[PDB]
């Protein structure tokens, strides 16, 4: 699809069997969700935003479905204001910016 | 252009008569730059992201050029870690996400 930017570009994601929604975010290296049902091990990591740096949980090799495209990648769980899909996953669904 | 997301989507901009670079940020409602020479009045504003809030100066109807495309819109200036182009300007140049 071709998605304009008059509103937040939010799409449906599926993760650990749950429907969530997340913002396609070209300004994020990484994918960050507030809360997942992934039951296993994670590694403590830190990310930075405009305001400073925060602790996240890093989950590796996560099956995740974006907008009906099935991918595998790294999902971070952290204190983000809204779920964001980063470039790490957007590259895998062949997402580009165009003008 | 068509911009893939394997690296950060950084483009050239021109504002207050200076060439800068800035990140195409579909996860930013607003456009924020670390420094600029602009004329006329600003009003104070707070913006939120990962890791807290930033205090900025808001300038309205500012002429900007993004990859050569001339656009007019609101620019925020403050101590961001990186120059960011938000949706408020990306819509002006017809930027879309495509997959």
């Amino acid at each position: 699809p071709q998605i304009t930017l008059w509103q937040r570009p939010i799409v449906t994601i599926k993760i650990g069997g749950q429907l969530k929604e997340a913002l396609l975010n070209t300004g994020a290296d990484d994918t960050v969700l507030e809360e997942v049902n992934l039951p296993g091990r994670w590694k403590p990591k830190l990310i930075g935003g405009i305001g400073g740096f925060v602790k996240v949980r890093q989950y590796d090799q996560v099956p995740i479905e974006i907008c009906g495209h099935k991918v595998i990648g790294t999902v971070l769980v952290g204190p983000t204001p809204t779920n964001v899909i980063g470039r790490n996953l957007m590259t895998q669904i062949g997402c580009t910016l165009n003008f | 252009p068509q911009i893939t997301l394997w690296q950060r989507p950084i483009v050239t901009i021109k504002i207050g008569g200076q060439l800068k670079e800035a990140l195409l940020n579909t996860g930013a409602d607003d456009t924020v730059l670390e420094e600029v020479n602009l004329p006329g009045r600003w009003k104070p504003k707070l913006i939120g992201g990962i890791g807290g809030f930033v205090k900025v100066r808001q300038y309205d109807q500012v002429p900007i050029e993004i990859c050569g495309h001339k656009v007019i819109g609101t620019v925020l200036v403050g101590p961001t870690p990186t120059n960011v182009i938000g949706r408020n300007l990306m819509t002006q140049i017809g930027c879309t996400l495509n997959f």
């Binding site: 975010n25 300004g27 994020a28 990484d30 990310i47 405009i50 971070l76 964001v84 | 913006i47 990186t82």
Partner: peptide
């Protein structure tokens, strides 16, 4: 909001 994020 400005959701720049970098790790």
């Amino acid at each position: 909001r400005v959701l720049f994020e970098a790790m």
